[PDB]
Amino acid sequence: DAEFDEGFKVPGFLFKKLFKYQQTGVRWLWELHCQQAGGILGDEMGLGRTIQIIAFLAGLSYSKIRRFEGLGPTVIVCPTTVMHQWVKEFHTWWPPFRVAILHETGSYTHKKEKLIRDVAHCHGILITSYSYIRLMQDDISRYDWHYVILDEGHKIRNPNAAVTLACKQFRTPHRIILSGSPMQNNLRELWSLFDFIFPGKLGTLPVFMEQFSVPITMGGYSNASPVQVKTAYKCACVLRDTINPYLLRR
Amino acid sequence: MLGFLSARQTGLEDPLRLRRAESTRRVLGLELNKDRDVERIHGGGINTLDIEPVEGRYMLSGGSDGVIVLYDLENSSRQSYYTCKAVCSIGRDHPDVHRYSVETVQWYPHDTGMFTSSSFDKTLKVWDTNTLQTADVFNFEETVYSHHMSPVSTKHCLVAVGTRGPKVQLCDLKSGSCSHILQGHRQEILAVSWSPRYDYILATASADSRVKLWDVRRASGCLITLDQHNGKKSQAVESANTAHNGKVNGLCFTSDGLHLLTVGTDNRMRLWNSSNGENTLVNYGKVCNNSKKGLKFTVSCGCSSEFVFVPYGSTIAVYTVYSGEQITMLKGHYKTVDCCVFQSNFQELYSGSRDCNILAWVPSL
Amino acid sequence: MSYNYVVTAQKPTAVNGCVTGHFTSAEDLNLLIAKNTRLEIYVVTAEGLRPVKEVGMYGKIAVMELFRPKGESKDLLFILTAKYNACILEYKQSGESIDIITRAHGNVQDRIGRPSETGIIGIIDPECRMIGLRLYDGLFKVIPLDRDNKELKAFNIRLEELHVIDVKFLYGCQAPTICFVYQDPQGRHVKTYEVSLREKEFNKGPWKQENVEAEASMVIAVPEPFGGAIIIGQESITYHNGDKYLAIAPPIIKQSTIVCHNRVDPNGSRYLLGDMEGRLFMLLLEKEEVTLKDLRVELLGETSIAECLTYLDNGVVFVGSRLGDSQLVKLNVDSNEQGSYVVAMETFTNLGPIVDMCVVDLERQGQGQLVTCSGAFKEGSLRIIRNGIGIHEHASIDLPGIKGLWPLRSDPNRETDDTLVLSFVGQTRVLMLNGEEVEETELMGFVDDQQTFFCGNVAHQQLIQITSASVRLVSQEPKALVSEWKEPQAKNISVASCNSSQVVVAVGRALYYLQIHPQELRQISHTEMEHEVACLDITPLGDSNGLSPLCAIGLWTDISARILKLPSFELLHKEMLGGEIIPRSILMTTFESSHYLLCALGDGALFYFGLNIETGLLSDRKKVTLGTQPTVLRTFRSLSTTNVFACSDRPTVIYSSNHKLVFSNVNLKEVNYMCPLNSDGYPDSLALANNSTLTIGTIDEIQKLHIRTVPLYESPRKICYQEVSQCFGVLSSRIEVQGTTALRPSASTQALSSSVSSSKLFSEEVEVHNLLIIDQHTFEVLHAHQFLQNEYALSLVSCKLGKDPNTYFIVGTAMVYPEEAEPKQGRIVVFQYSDGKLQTVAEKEVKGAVYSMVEFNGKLLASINSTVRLYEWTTEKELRTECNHYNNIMALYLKTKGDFILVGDLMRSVLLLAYKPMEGNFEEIARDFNPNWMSAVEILDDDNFLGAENAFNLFVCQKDSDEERQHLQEVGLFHLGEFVNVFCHGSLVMPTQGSVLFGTVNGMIGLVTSLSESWYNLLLDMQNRLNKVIKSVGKIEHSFWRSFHTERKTEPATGFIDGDLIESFLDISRPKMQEVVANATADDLIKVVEELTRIH
DNA sequence: CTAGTTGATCTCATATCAGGAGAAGGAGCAGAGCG
């Protein structure tokens, strides 16, 4: 087995299947769990980013870390295309977990709320889509989720979209975003992602814009004075430093 | 005592006994030393004092006039009478002097080379002690009531800042990141204090009568909200769980960091278990404060019994922390007392007050 | 930077903790004794204790407990160090090799925490599921064992009670359940908690909190049949098992508090309880069928003041004392007709709390000799320490009351003396001593009917035997006597003397000269002296012809070691000595240079002379005092030269080194007589008799400290030597109860003469203070002056002041009343000891306690409460102030070197004061502004000031190189682990500069000395190498152990070399040395470390 | 029953001079108590 600080043992066979960077990832995710903070797995796509979550959750359940005796009920929000992909992935890389799909396709064939309750009681891994999160913020946000992974989490990049608010209604600190590109147009998107994972780190949205987005943007324009270039440089470095612990971008 | 010297000498008692018992005896004998003075440099009231944690030689002092004075507390003259001369001073002419009242001033723990000072000009300035130039300035949108650096953090170098905003700002002195905020208070935060025991535990007290302990690493809000009654009056927490029946304008962890002392404008002091915020029901009687800003008070260290020195109007009221028995009230100031700071090496107390004086209390004989 | 070398001259002797168990093997019963830094492992044999291993911990052993985890064969040892190094030690013996492997270790020091008042407690669950440590107020550290660690990861449980007195794990509980007494404002209560290693928090205990006696200080966990706990308080012993509440108040335990306990049985039907008075109680649990019926306390007797006591087996109890000698007692079933069942089997020397000490060149040698105020209330005593020689006790035979020993070559061919002769009362018994075997077989020609004053081998291949009746010259080879002479009046010879060639025997007041001729005894000379002969010697020395030329005589009533010319018996010289005591032995020998004479009186005085071969006139009279018993002197020839031996209470070898007469001690209890023997089975050996047996052995170069003990039976406090008067002045203190009554006859109450202070200045149990004048030869209390009622003698100096010539005992006192915390009154009393009396020559009422007085350039420098003032001795013989100094919290310690005064403060730690004589006032030169609470201070150099803080640290301050020049610089830091009570210049021996001894509370005697920069660098390098090579018991780092440590500061050592670690460079094999000496050759460093060991 | 198709239907994302009269406030200031 592989052992980390307090009680985290991930099975050795599982660990050996991973790469070195994926192992680093698993360690990083567990350090966050210790802090009770969230993070963004900003690995460039194709780098087997999803496998890291499997390994980490597997290790956490296996270690039976101490409300919850190891891994509680958890929800995975991922784009509609990849739900069965994730189901497949859990099934191969760790059969023991129950991975219920929440979708019209699904596998339940009853009312959905019964399925939500079932997973929240039997401590499964409820996969769902951003739509069903937007549409059942009421039902879903009544069950003490342990982990709230968002795959391709950039879809929460609009702080005012409904889906964003719904995703930010979840209460647990163990929020994770798996986003190949956690910033696509401007930093307002970044702030939004951080406000899901770590609600206070970057401040309020107005303050973030005032302090970071404006200066960092103005330093990119061709006509910007060198002074403003250097303010942008400063602010950019501050931002990287602020977000360093909580973003793992290989 | 000669029993104490003989007991130390013969090994009957651990020398720890003589140290702590004598340290206590010295604290009980605190009296206004007219055989010691502090040089008058503040034109306005002293809001804050800070003796450096390593070597306890120097004291910072922040005035209502905006100046920061840096005193030397060692008697370098051969006389038995001396004035604690002022080494440096952020005076009226310093380009970086605060525009309004300096509300807090703090030595960087782990090193005397840097200190920080926050004011009503909405700035927390970091100073290089040697060159006495600002190394950094954090601007806040709202006047700063208090800040505090962790006395224990070898790892993080966050400054918790309480402003009139309802939010607690964490300023990372390592690469300057003043974005992080703790949310959950509703009115001005009048006092913040890091745990001396836990690296990332912060206690913040606010005018909404609530005190919250935070794990700033944690991304999920306050750990604990101190509740006067511990549950006798229990309500779905939206307005209940008040530490006090007024504003809570003072915080101080006891030395070992296992208890928290809060003073609020209901004229009470309470002692809280810092682990589960449970009220220990220590009485302390009535502690007059009506300060509209933070009230800086300290505890003793390295005595047989712990003491807390609280400004009580124009006096320093000394209490035994764990029993509440008021030792004495040190009467030597002329106006209300704003801050007292404890010199742990010699059981000396310095207290500033609105009458522009800093009085030394040293044990008698 | 300062370069200091610290080493241990005497390892700590105070037993701070002892446990018993099966540590070295499952069948061995071990006694593990913690002396402060030394762990001593014994095996509990049917008789006494057999040492097996003594290891040095890099720590003060604060906790020491044996526990056996499941499946383990033999007990593992848990040790917690004062700096909070935890370790679990196992004993692994591989044939000859012995190891202490560290099964686990760690550092459990919390970064912050109020160290608990009562002190570090360490308990172990009776089922070894966890080690509970109470280190700080309000916390309870748990070290799991079921989770088998190697790093001892421990977690705190928050304890809702902040003042915990004592705590124990209860027995017979499914969960680890602690029972502790804690003090809250409402009184003292006993509470229980269950420890959950899974939830890592307490739970409700089996039986709720109970309000107990006010002074409950002890919890005793009682094994499974009863369960529950027994809480000992001052006036009651109460038993709790949850519903049962037995409670007794035995009136016998009210007089003193019970401080240690031990479970005699495995089932807890009997406990030992030791009190601070030294009583030993037996607490009996009467079972009823099982529950507990009733409690009984019975007084077994008295022991040394026990810190810890352990019951070994068969009634043998080890009483480990910090204040007095540790004891091995026996508990008899029946009383001793004095009400006591305790009978001391063995005593282990403990230089107890060394509160003061002085180095006196007693016996007028070139050797220092420590005299220490050791011990406490009932165990107080003076210990005299000196470096002494030792030998091996090979051949023993127990014949009572020997009075003779002579080497005889019964085999005529060999020049080895293969036969030993002994006279007892009126006969001669011989020994074949064949080989190493010893049995009594008879050689012809010697009589079994008469005492023998002398016998031995003589010339012409003849033996000689001088009896109480007449002389017998035997021919060795052929047969018995062919020559006999006897006194014509047949008077018994009263004093004899003989050599290889001639004979000289005294008959009362007349003397007879005989000389040997082959098969003949010829008489020549005769004389009639004034008075009876006392002693003779006729030894031929540098003879070179065949006959000695000279003789010496001691006579009665005209006490004089006179000289005679041999052929004429005439007076060459007549030198008186004085006193009413007849000299009992006289000898002349050569020490490398010429004939000396050694004449002694019955009280150990001994005069050495330069004797001429022509005039034989006695001059160069000088005296040395050796022992109190009458003496006898017999030589043995070593490899090098003649080495004379003195036989008395203190056997002493006598010899000259570099043409300087040395008076070495021998580390044997007593020797009646001595004789050389060089058998085939015994080369160059000694033959040393005592009252019981004949001890035989050789001479060993290595020196072992010899510790005398003078029981004072009261706490000595100070000691100074007044050479002019031949005495020690000792401040003693005895505890009286009621007006008052002495609880026991102390040394003060048993003096020859006595007196009490009648002073005009000032007009349960109390402390009475006396000034003891103690004879520096016999160590008898010549005089005991009691001080005023409620007067505490603190300081004591012997000196002569001003210009008058009298040497005074000056005592500084304080008046101690319970109504106050610091004395307001005190006085400086000047005594003069002369004509066996202690007159009060002066007095001076001062307004505080006189904590310290040093004689300072003809003037008295006293330190009253916070003032240091200088007194002058006026022509009127009174003390008159000259200057004061006030900038002190408490001037506790004063030292002096020239015009400079070093003041150790209660908590401002040192101050360098200068008496500028041109002005007549003090000047604060430098000061150390760190808050160090001093225990003692010393001046090493003109600018190096050794200090000892009460946190077991040594620091050296240095006057630096403006107003920053008034800052002493701490250039030396070192954690000793011992509480220094005293420094003193001197050395116990005949590269390094200076030598400062210090005595500690634990009984360590250490030695600080100054190194040069080059040697310091070299030794620091080797220190690092040894740290890289030598492995400590608990895997503690030496640098961490020697790091300066205080509750508000911690810095690495510097400017100090652990001489213990360096001297450990000899006790490692050559490959390990090469590992040490990678980057000069090893033999160089072996020479270096030998030369370093030469200093102590 | 089950995929497949097909509307709605929602969400989210993309970008730079000949007026006059009267009423209300404020300012300046004399002066009167008055502490």
Curated annotation (Swiss-Prot), chain A:
Family per record: Belongs to the SNF2/RAD54 helicase family.
Helicase ATP-binding domain location: 30-200
Record disease entry: Cockayne syndrome B: A rare disorder characterized by cutaneous sensitivity to sunlight, abnormal and slow growth, cachectic dwarfism, progeroid appearance, progressive pigmentary retinopathy and sensorineural deafness. There is delayed neural development and severe progressive neurologic degeneration resulting in intellectual disability.
Compartments where found: Nucleus; Chromosome
Function in brief: Essential factor involved in transcription-coupled nucleotide excision repair (TC-NER), a process during which RNA polymerase II-blocking lesions are rapidly removed from the transcribed strand of active genes. Plays a central role in the initiation of the TC-NER process: specifically recognizes and binds RNA polymerase II stalled at a lesion, and mediates recruitment of ERCC8/CSA, initiating DNA damage excision by TFIIH recruitment.
Span of the annotated motif DEAH box: 151-154
Post-translational modification: Phosphorylation at these two sites promotes the intramolecular interaction of the N-terminal domain with the helicase ATP-binding domain, thereby probably releasing the inhibitory effect of the N-terminal domain on its ATPase activity. Phosphorylation is essential for its chromatin remodeling activity. Ubiquitinated at the C-terminus. Ubiquitination by the CSA complex leads to ERCC6 proteasomal degradation in a UV-dependent manner. Stabilized following interaction with KIAA1530/UVSSA, which promotes recruitment of deubiquitinating enzyme USP7, leading to deubiquitination of ERCC6 thereby preventing UV-induced degradation of ERCC6 by the proteasome.
Protein name as it appears in the record: DNA excision repair protein ERCC-6
Binding site for ATP: D43, E44, M45, G46, L47, G48, R49, T50
Taxonomy, superkingdom: Eukaryota
Full protein stretch here: 490 to 745 of 1493
Swiss-Prot record, chain B:
Compartments, record wording: Nucleus; Chromosome; Nucleus matrix
One term under GO cellular component: nucleoplasm
Pfam family, one: WD40
One Gene Ontology biological process: proteasome-mediated ubiquitin-dependent protein catabolic process
Gene Ontology MF: a single term: ubiquitin-like ligase-substrate adaptor activity
WD repeats: 33-73, 88-129, 133-173, 177-216, 235-274, 281-321, 325-363
The keyword Signal appears for this protein: no
UniProt pathway annotation: Protein modification; protein ubiquitination
SMART domains noted in UniProt: WD40
Keywords tagged on the record: Chromosome, Cockayne syndrome, Deafness, Disease variant, DNA damage, DNA repair, Dwarfism, Nucleus, Phosphoprotein, Repeat, Ubl conjugation pathway, WD repeat
Principal subcellular localisation of the protein: nucleus
Subunit text: Part of the CSA complex (also named DCX(ERCC8) complex), a DCX E3 ubiquitin-protein ligase complex containing ERCC8, RBX1, DDB1 and CUL4A; the CSA complex interacts with RNA polymerase II; upon UV irradiation it interacts with the COP9 signalosome and preferentially with the hyperphosphorylated form of RNA polymerase II. Interacts with ERCC6/CSB (via CIM motif); promoting recruitment to lesion-stalled RNA polymerase II (Pol II). Interacts with KIAA1530/UVSSA. Interacts with a subunit of RNA polymerase II TFIIH.
Its biological purpose: Substrate-recognition component of the CSA complex, a DCX (DDB1-CUL4-X-box) E3 ubiquitin-protein ligase complex, involved in transcription-coupled nucleotide excision repair (TC-NER), a process during which RNA polymerase II-blocking lesions are rapidly removed from the transcribed strand of active genes. Following recruitment to lesion-stalled RNA polymerase II (Pol II), the CSA complex mediates ubiquitination of Pol II subunit POLR2A/RPB1 at 'Lys-1268', a critical TC-NER checkpoint, governing RNA Pol II stability and initiating DNA damage excision by TFIIH recruitment.
Name of the featured protein: DNA excision repair protein ERCC-8
Lineage: Eukaryota, Metazoa, Chordata, Craniata, Vertebrata
Protein's gene: ERCC8
Curated annotation (Swiss-Prot), chain C:
Primary localization: cytoplasm
Molecular function via GO: cullin family protein binding; damaged DNA binding; DNA binding; protein-containing complex binding; protein-macromolecule adaptor activity; ubiquitin ligase complex scaffold activity; WD40-repeat domain binding
Swiss-Prot/TrEMBL keywords: Acetylation, Biological rhythms, Cytoplasm, Disease variant, DNA damage, DNA repair, DNA-binding, Host-virus interaction, Intellectual disability, Isopeptide bond, Nucleus, Phosphoprotein, Repeat, Ubl conjugation, Ubl conjugation pathway
Assigned GO CC terms: chromosome, telomeric region; Cul4-RING E3 ubiquitin ligase complex; Cul4A-RING E3 ubiquitin ligase complex; Cul4B-RING E3 ubiquitin ligase complex; cytoplasm; extracellular exosome; extracellular space; nucleolus
Residues with the N6-acetyllysine modification: K1035
Segments of this protein annotated with the region WD repeat beta-propeller B: 387-703
Chain positions with N-acetylserine modification: S2
Secretion signal, residue range per the UniProt entry: none
Keyword Transferase found: no
Region named Interaction with CDT1 and CUL4A: 762-1096
Modified-residue entries (Phosphothreonine), positions: T1081
Keyword Membrane appears in the UniProt entry: no
Entry comment on modification after translation: Phosphorylated by ABL1. Ubiquitinated by CUL4A. Subsequently degraded by ubiquitin-dependent proteolysis.
Residue segments, region WD repeat beta-propeller C: 704-1011
Localization per record: Cytoplasm; Nucleus
Task performed by this protein: Protein, which is both involved in DNA repair and protein ubiquitination, as part of the UV-DDB complex and DCX (DDB1-CUL4-X-box) complexes, respectively. Core component of the UV-DDB complex (UV-damaged DNA-binding protein complex), a complex that recognizes UV-induced DNA damage and recruit proteins of the nucleotide excision repair pathway (the NER pathway) to initiate DNA repair. The UV-DDB complex preferentially binds to cyclobutane pyrimidine dimers (CPD), 6-4 photoproducts (6-4 PP), apurinic sites and short mismatches.
Family stated for the protein in its record: Belongs to the DDB1 family.
Disease: White-Kernohan syndrome: An autosomal dominant disorder characterized by global developmental delay, variably impaired intellectual development, hypotonia, and characteristic facial features. Some patients may have genitourinary and skeletal abnormalities.
Annotated source species: Homo sapiens
Encoding gene (name): DDB1
